[PDB]
Amino acid sequence: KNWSALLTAVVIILTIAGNILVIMAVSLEKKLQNATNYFLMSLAIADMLLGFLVMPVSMLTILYGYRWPLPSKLCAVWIYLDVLFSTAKIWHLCAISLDRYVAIQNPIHHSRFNSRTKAFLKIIAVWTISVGISMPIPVFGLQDDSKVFKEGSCLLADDNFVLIGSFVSFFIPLTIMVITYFLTIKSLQKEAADLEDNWETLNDNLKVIEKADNAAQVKDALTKMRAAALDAGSGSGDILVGQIDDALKLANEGKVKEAQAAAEQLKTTINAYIQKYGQSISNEQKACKVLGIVFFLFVVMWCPFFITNIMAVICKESCNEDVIGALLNVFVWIGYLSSAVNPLVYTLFNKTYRSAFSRYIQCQY
């Protein structure tokens, strides 16, 4: 009746508002300009399109009693959209991890000069592959009207489509995301270990310089310190390398008594920069944790719908399907609420998201 129509109607507007907020935050804040936030904005675009088009149609179908009120030729469109955006999201997320798994493994990943157009084309390519995956739904639904209509109700009825799409769209990106998340935490655990080794090497060679009577000892210690400071090529790694090379210039000239005071000043710079480099890896893994959270939430909230759809294929004879069919009618809306959940996490964890969204609240832009 109507006591559940209101419950399923708030989800649409919450999804719309939250994802429009996310789009505005990504497109407005100058601090979010990188590949990950561009992918998140594309994800928010997909969520906003899903909430603007598919969710209200599903709501009106619910209020009409799970009956299709639109022209019969548009049903194949509806499912297509419901596949086009979600398949994007599960592949957008799967993209991000992969990118963040590989774009950080090059030894100069902590550098500036991010490839904006490269990430833009990556997003376009992910959308293109999602379009290619989603094309069969309308292509084979326009020909056969019994593939998108299951005895008067507009939903996927082809068991082959259900199985393959569940494998292709849902399970494969989920497994890829899990494996890449594990490999990402394993890889990032090594970053914080090499940095500590560089810090220890710098401390050892600074101890060596402080107590010295030779001229080439300074050269050896400064060379070892030069190798340690190189690190992930931040660019201000080279400002520390440049200062070390300045002291190395003093040593190679010959004045030992002058190089030691310089290295003392560089020691203060070294401690400051390492506490800045090791802090950068902390954010590098915090973003990974937040993205893992959003992966988990999306997958878990879309799980029951796929579980029941897979159930409805193989055991079509040895499984009761009286109330189980009605379970899908709320599992689909759990999957829809997965769209609205993401901005909540963004406001819960990412500080810039919190500030921007609070700015837009309480009678303000």
Ligand X SMILES: CC(C)COc1ccc(CNC(=O)N(Cc2ccc(F)cc2)C2CCN(C)CC2)cc1
Q: Is 166 in the site for ligand X (CB under 6 A)?
A: yes
Residue that the structure tokens 């490839």 belong to:
115
Residue window 306-325: x/- pattern of binding to ligand X, with contact defined by CB under 6 A:
--------------------
| Total residues in contact with ligand X, by rule CB under 6 A | 22
Q: Is 19 in the site for ligand X (CB under 6 A)?
A: no
The least CB distance from residue 89 to ligand X, in Å, is 6
In 3D space, the residue among 213, 195, 180, 356 whose CA is nearest the CA of residue 280 turns out to be 195
Are the CB atoms for 185 and 285 separated by under 8 Å? yes
228-229-231-235 Cα dihedral, nearest 10 degrees: -170
The least CB distance from residue 302 to ligand X, in Å, is 5
Strands 153-154 and 149-150: antiparallel
User: Toward ligand X, which CB reaches closer, 239 or 300?
Assistant: 300
The least CB distance from residue 133 to ligand X, in Å, is 5
Residue nearest to ligand X (CB): 165
Q: Tell me the two tokens of residue 294.
A: 């959003």
Distance from C-alpha of 136 to C-alpha of 161, rounded to nearest angstrom: 9
Instruction: Specify burial of residue 245 (Cβ count, 10 A radius: 0-12, 13-18, 19+).
Output: middle
Residue window 250-289: x/- pattern of binding to ligand X, with contact defined by CB under 6 A:
----------------------------------------
The least CB distance from residue 137 to ligand X, in Å, is 5
Are the CB atoms for 23 and 344 separated by under 8 Å? no
Q: Which of 38, 199, 273, 302 binds ligand X (CB under 6 A)?
A: 302
Neighbours of 329 (CB within 10 A): 17
Q: Tell me the two tokens of residue 78.
A: 């509806």
Q: How many CA atoms lie within 13 A of 165 on its CB side?
A: 26
Q: Is 169 in the site for ligand X (CB under 6 A)?
A: yes
Return the residues of window 176-205 that contact ligand X according to CB under 6 A: none
The least CB distance from residue 204 to ligand X, in Å, is 52
Q: Which of 168, 193, 314, 326 binds ligand X (CB under 6 A)?
A: 168
Q: Is 77 in the site for ligand X (CB under 6 A)?
A: no
Distance from C-alpha of 217 to C-alpha of 251, rounded to nearest angstrom: 9
Beta bridge partners of 153: 150
Q: Is 13 in the site for ligand X (CB under 6 A)?
A: no
User: Toward ligand X, which CB reaches closer, 107 or 132?
Assistant: 132
Q: Which residues bind ligand X (CB under 6 A)?
A: 79, 82-83, 86-87, 90, 133, 136-137, 156, 161-162, 164-166, 168-170, 302, 305, 332, 335
